[PDB]
Design a protein around this ligand. Structure first.
Ligand SMILES: Cc1cn([C@H]2C[C@H](O)[C@@H](COP(=O)(O)OP(=O)(O)OP(=O)(O)O)O2)c(=O)[nH]c1=O
Ligand SMILES: Cc1cn([C@H]2C[C@H](O)[C@@H](COP(=O)(O)OP(=O)(O)OP(=O)(O)O)O2)c(=O)[nH]c1=O
Ligand SMILES: Cc1cn([C@H]2C[C@H](O)[C@@H](COP(=O)(O)OP(=O)(O)OP(=O)(O)O)O2)c(=O)[nH]c1=O
Ligand SMILES: Cc1cn([C@H]2C[C@H](O)[C@@H](COP(=O)(O)OP(=O)(O)OP(=O)(O)O)O2)c(=O)[nH]c1=O
Ligand SMILES: [Mg+2]
Lengths: 480, 480, 480, 479
């Protein structure tokens, strides 16, 4: 039988018994202990929500879209088997997230294990495999008409893309539109965003959203270059632009909030300091570190936001340094935000260069009297890539549309056909600088270094530059 | 008289000072209950039943909130209760001048019915305001509550319509910031937008709006070029860009919906056909027409959306033609939307040229076989100016900011200091074409004329151009 | 073909072309000019909504429920024909409402035409026929597979009940009995009409309360009950059903029967009575009707809407001076004054036929207090309001069938004692409001004395403010 | 300066710097790790919210109400000092909650430490004292004009009541201030107002109390020789609705049958872990889950984390505790059998709760059964549902005023309002569950249960005729 669940975003949602079986596992229930926005909760107190409930939402919306396409276009031959596979992929696409979500894969792993190339998407696939095998799900899949060999492959492909011509093995070209629902590699328009827009806004207290219900009603499948793809109605093109504008707004105001990011940074530092001493038991009783738990799904299953509290509540002297950082978070003695700037023209900063940047800021030499002299280790420089999901490219150039007068005929719509008030660029970098020395004099010094460093590098003038560094800003003619 | 509490679905329970209640409980104000905020938009968005009355309450309330907030935070501004009430009254009364179907009346009907005259709802609001005050003995009531009618009436009118050197007489330069609350001529950031974003979204069914409560909390007054102005906190700049983006979204999706506009056009047409025959009694028993009721406020008081029904329910044979158009609206036999295009690059179309455009479309000679030949009178061409409120200018360039480290010091923030993902242009024109002949063949013909016309004029390729006019689009090399 | 409409309560809803044909008629579109809450708009400014949009909502929810039952239980043999008939009945159940909705049938007609018995439900049926016959809808119905003779009967029965046991309906047989429970549930009043108005009225009034109908639809099933197939609710929903009726009563108390909204309805009714001789409405064959006789000709009734209010207000004819003066008093907020509220004690119930005598009784009370002025029957208005759970003294939940998870096909009854001791022991009551047409201070004071004396004389409940408004009277009654 | 914070329920709220100092302490931040609804999150997935954000809301609303009263009635002499003390009490009233909130004081402590009498309210006062002393807050209070000796007493009194006019923190002329945060007279306070709105937002139930309306109509009047908060007469129906809503929310959410069983399972796991888990308190001294309430330094570190510490443990001593939590993750929960209520006169005492599983197991249904069940196979959960004041009507303990005499307080009786109101204001619900989840065990449990209801003259379970068609006929009253 169906289970009904009340979700505050989507209302009462029905879950097929197979989905319930997947949900009621330690691998899935784990998502209850991982905050969707990580350190954002420490800035937006409404953002208490966890990955668990977001995953239900994604699974539900995936089901909505595939059901809608099937109702409208029986000739697509969408089967219940297809519907369940799409729902399962929707449910399980977040399985791979670690403590504090993007902090873990965005900050901690890159620093702890630079050799490795690792993403929550890969984690989701591994967790999914572990979930299936640990809980005897394959037999249950067969009971409901699924074919595990093909369908597990199809599900993994929906999350992570080809495990590698038509590159997919889980389904053929005629069902290509199914791969656009959960995680859309072509243009990023998928049900994951649609849930998190609505859920995050509900919790953050921001009244913004994408109308996904409207979008689903106007979605159709058409042939595009000998593939069946999801097409949007021509009139939806402006709403799609708005969708990405919203996404960017949410990153600016919330996901990349300057303080939420510094808290993530502080937690990451604490995890690095604890990484040698914390042990997580995996398969065979055998022990992993925070940074190696990714190698064993049984261990990774037990790696959640709980680690934060394990460190905070520890008494072991080896963890004193890690614990001290978290204590500073509770007292709100955070690293201090100094300012924000951007690279000018086409200058872009490489990931490998990130390490050198604190050194560059400390090297600056402002022509101002300073009580204190700061060092590289006193500065944090956070570089944030902001885009429309596709680096420099416009995702709407990778969207196919149809018109009311010829619903089967797919078309392209260029930016110029829509509006001159749209963005001319679709990617940029933000640079935030913080100082670990929080006293008045240290902070004043840090401002001088920072603004001097912006000038030296011909970055943009910080918005408060004339107030925080009135002696420095006059030197740069461009600024005034 | 005592203070009144009223439950508004947008703002909750709001308190109204007895003076404001006296102004509200007049025929001149209550009239606004019978004018739809969005006019013909109700005929596309069925939730948009709301009238100008309740919007006016909201504007008055928010005007009060902002001025109170400024006073609390900065006593040195010397904001008085008298100032607060004047600002609230201007907020309440700013919409008094709207006519039937709001912007239809101002924007479409009067320009066509009385081209000699130059008329705006803003001017109407001032005239109505005067009429309201004098007809209802409000001046004595104003003095009772500490207002000085000569100065304060002038101040209120100036807030609505601008000046009738420091050009204002109602308040001096030290109180300049008060003129920025109700109708902000400098940059358009005022409480009117804040109420209509939230109210229209609530009714339309679209999730958006601007967080005005947040904005009020971060608003301050600072000296700018020897004037005291409202300044926003530096960190709010992105939210201000977002405010205008939202405004433009709402215009695109709702206020300029292609069908809501054609319904307004049809109603305008019916009013033109009824203008000779409908009589409205004004001062001294003198009779006016729909188009001349603007000259006498006693008459204009009785001119509301009711005239629509007076025409629809008429039996007089003189009104048969007007009545037939409205009947077509009820049967949904509307003029048919042919398409949309834009001028390319810097071309702009003047208001005086609008008349000639249907002639131009009818003069296009598409190289296609047509059964039927269309005439100028068969075409409607609607030209819509879409901007950020200041024609080609960026309103954020006319905003002053302050930073946390020096709250009294105003600064400027340029677009390059905020984001490269912002618009490079801030005004554009949309051109919609419709046809009054609704049969299949007439419509097909209209499409060919339209696309040919776009090509001839080097306008943008209509989004569905290749589908509606496959023979025409190939000729233009630019289009493909 | 399908139309999509954005409703702020339900989101994007699809309408089948047949329903669109019904909607795009003067008989339907008329509902755009009738306020859902009538005079309530004059108390809650958000309540600008009209019967039109509510009707779309009812039609949509009727569809949702019937679709849900069909998905879950294919063995019911629900056909698309069934679905459309249920939707049409949902759309059309409000067609019979007159100006200001319940004012018209609840106040005006009873007073203008006491000989006649008339209800909006009967109006809806008559309007429905008129709509079908005037617009050639029967052929269109046949085109989509409907059988007009049966189906029109079925639709009318859904609105108004049987047109004259064991099975009293002709439009559908006992096996389809559950379909008659969707639009207007005569058995217990649990239907989609309430579900829409709770959510819509709350959204507009600014009250957060509503009933979770989407939850209810998910738990609804059809079971055999006494050889009929009926809708049954899950046992666990019984408390939510009690809550549904509590919400209904809350809404009546706070809004639909707000003391001032009611007095405004009363004033408008008085104005209509005074205009009834002079206003003419053209019906079939050019024949002329009055406001009170337009109910006899649907062509005339089609043109009878809230517009009449403004026609009276804006009139210059001296015959209409008295009517017009009443409406003018409404605009100035010079209303009949609320004196107080009381209830009958224990057994006592007051009949509609007695309503005329009550003002006489109040005027006959002889308070032992010094009075400057002496009041007459004609100076008093006594409004008696019946508040119940939809079924006079009866508990509607006693007329609900439930099922349990362990035997889903087995219908059961649940008594009040099986649910809670905190529920109501009675399900009907009366409120008595008294108002005075003389608004001066001395007249009002006198009215209060008559009123409280009258309450004491009749052993009604002590008005809440009784000791404040009549400190000399309340001591005489020992109980109080 | 003021901090501004965006709360999804209240919007942008300003926090005075003193309140920020109190918030940015381990004692306060601890509330981030305690779910407001405990096991309810396991039934309503939207209910992720913690006590922390609820406490911000309560503090804000406390400020709103006191500010409103001050604006409207300057003659009350409400000072900024008064405002801050009321806000602090609002912020800090939830400080004393333990893991999974009401589970801890409602289920676990009573079972683990029956000799002790403990409430989260007492915990809040103890935590508050610990917070102040540990973080040097007293000097900061004086900096902003507070007088710690009087004002700390006043704050504690607001949370827990008195430690003649029985209060020492403020005099009788300021008595209305004690009605804002935790209203002992009738329960109408800002704590409910926040949790109604916040819980509804998260649970997905569009129900609520309009507290903004209420605040606008609230006034202080003399009642007896006390200054009290009085509501406008017209708000009486809203106040009845407020308690109806409260009871609705308890029925649908806070006492959800499955949420309660999960709380019961977690409590059981804690009891099994209580001997083995150690929490370091003051002086390096070690405490147990059940004794951490004696030392605030230890209690500071006692949060929902303990659930995961047990779940992730490898120690064999914790196997039994860990197994129970593992069953929760697999959703192998004890099964709900049914619900019943005592009839007429009858009420069940707390001391009798233990015996009830024995009584159910002792019922002898006249039906053929494959399996025989034992006392230990049954859980019987007895829930007292009321309007906050046992049998009493809280509206009888509310004072009102009318628009014609705003300074004259009055009473409004139930009969003056409506005959559709409740005639009783307290009742008991009895839920029975079975630890044996198989088909045959279930079927047996249902027979025992319904027989037991019959034997005890309890109400007929709603599905009684379906689950026990052989049993229900014997009882004439039922049919
Ligand atoms: C009882 C109830 C539950 N809910 C929510 C909580 C859950 O997320 C979801 C399902 O809860 P329930 O409907 O209570 O489902 P259940 O599994 O507890 O009962 P059973 O298996 O006997 O049918 O609905 C409400 O929103 N409102 C309510 O009134
Ligand atoms: C009674 C009531 C009114 N309202 C709304 C309707 C109105 O817009 C607003 C004020 O209505 P009321 O509070 O009814 O005020 P009133 O002027 O009718 O009564 P009095 O003059 O005696 O104080 O509040 C609610 O939102 N909830 C309620 O429970
Ligand atoms: C354009 C648009 C419309 N709406 C609403 C307004 C209407 O109620 C509903 C239908 O609007 P449209 O989708 O614009 O439908 P249409 O009939 O105008 O277009 P076409 O016939 O070419 O398909 O959608 C939105 O909610 N958001 C939007 O962006
Ligand atoms: C930036 C931003 C924050 N918020 C929320 C997040 C926080 O809860 C709250 C405060 O955030 P900020 O206003 O960013 O406060 P801050 O302390 O980071 O900035 P500063 O100290 O420089 O003044 O507002 C929004 O709602 N919208 C926004 O656009
Ligand atoms: Mg009033």
């Amino acid at each position: 039988t169906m289970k009904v669940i009340n979700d505050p975003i989507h209302g009462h949602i029905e879950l097929h018994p197979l989905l319930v079986r997947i949900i009621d596992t330690p691998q899935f229930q784990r998502l209850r202990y991982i905050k969707q926005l990580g350190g954002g909760y420490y800035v937006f107190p409404g953002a208490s929500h966890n990955r668990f409930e977001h995953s239900l939402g994604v699974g539900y919306l995936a089901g909505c879209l595939v059901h809608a396409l099937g109702e409208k276009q029986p000739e697509l031959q969408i089967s219940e088997r297809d519907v369940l596979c799409v729902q399962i992929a929707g449910l399980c696409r977040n399985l791979g997230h670690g403590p504090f979500s993007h902090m873990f894969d965005g900050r901690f792993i890159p620093l702890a294990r630079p050799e490795v190339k690792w993403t929550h998407e890969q984690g989701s696939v591994m967790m999914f495999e572990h979930l299936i095998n640990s809980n005897g799900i394959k037999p249950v899949m067969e009971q409901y008409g699924l074919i595990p060999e093909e369908d597990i492959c199809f599900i993994k492909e929906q999350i992570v893309g080809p495990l590698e011509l038509w590159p997919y093995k889980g389904r053929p070209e005629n069902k290509s539109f199914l791969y656009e629902i959960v995680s859309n590699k072509r243009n990023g328009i998928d049900v994951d965003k649609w849930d998190y827009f609505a859920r995050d806004c509900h919790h953050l207290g921001i009244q913004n959203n994408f109308d996904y219900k409207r979008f689903i009603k106007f979605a159709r499948v058409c042939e595009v270059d000998n593939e069946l793809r999801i097409c949007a109605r021509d009139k939806e093109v402006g709403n799609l632009y708005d969708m990405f504008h919203t996404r960017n707004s949410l990153h600016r105001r919330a996901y990349q909030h300057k303080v939420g990011n510094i808290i993530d940074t502080m937690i990451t530092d604490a995890f690095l300091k604890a990484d040698d001493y914390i042990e997580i038991t995996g398969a065979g009783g055998k022990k992993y570190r925070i940074s190696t738990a990714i190698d064993d799904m049984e261990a990774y299953t037990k790696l959640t936001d709980n680690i934060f509290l394990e460190i905070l509540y520890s008494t072991d002297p080896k963890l004193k340094d890690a614990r001290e950082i978290l204590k500073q978070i509770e007292y709100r003695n955070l690293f201090k935000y100094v300012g924000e700037t951007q690279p000018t023209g086409q200058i872009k900063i490489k990931r490998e260069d990130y390490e050198s940047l604190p050194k560059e800021v400390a090297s600056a030499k402002p022509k101002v009297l300073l009580d204190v002299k700061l060092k590289a280790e006193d500065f944090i420089v956070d570089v944030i890539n902001m885009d429309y999901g596709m680096q420099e490219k416009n995702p709407i150039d990778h969207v196919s549309f149809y018109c009311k007068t010829a619903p089967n005929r797919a078309i392209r719509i260029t930016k110029n056909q829509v509006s001159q008030l749209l963005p001319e660029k679709f990617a940029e970098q933000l640079i935030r600088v913080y100082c670990k020395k929080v006293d008045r004099k240290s902070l004043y010094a840090a401002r001088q270094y920072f603004v001097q460093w912006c000038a030296d590098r011909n970055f943009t003038k910080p918005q408060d530059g004339d107030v925080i560094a009135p002696l420095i800003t006059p030197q740069k003619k461009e600024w005034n």
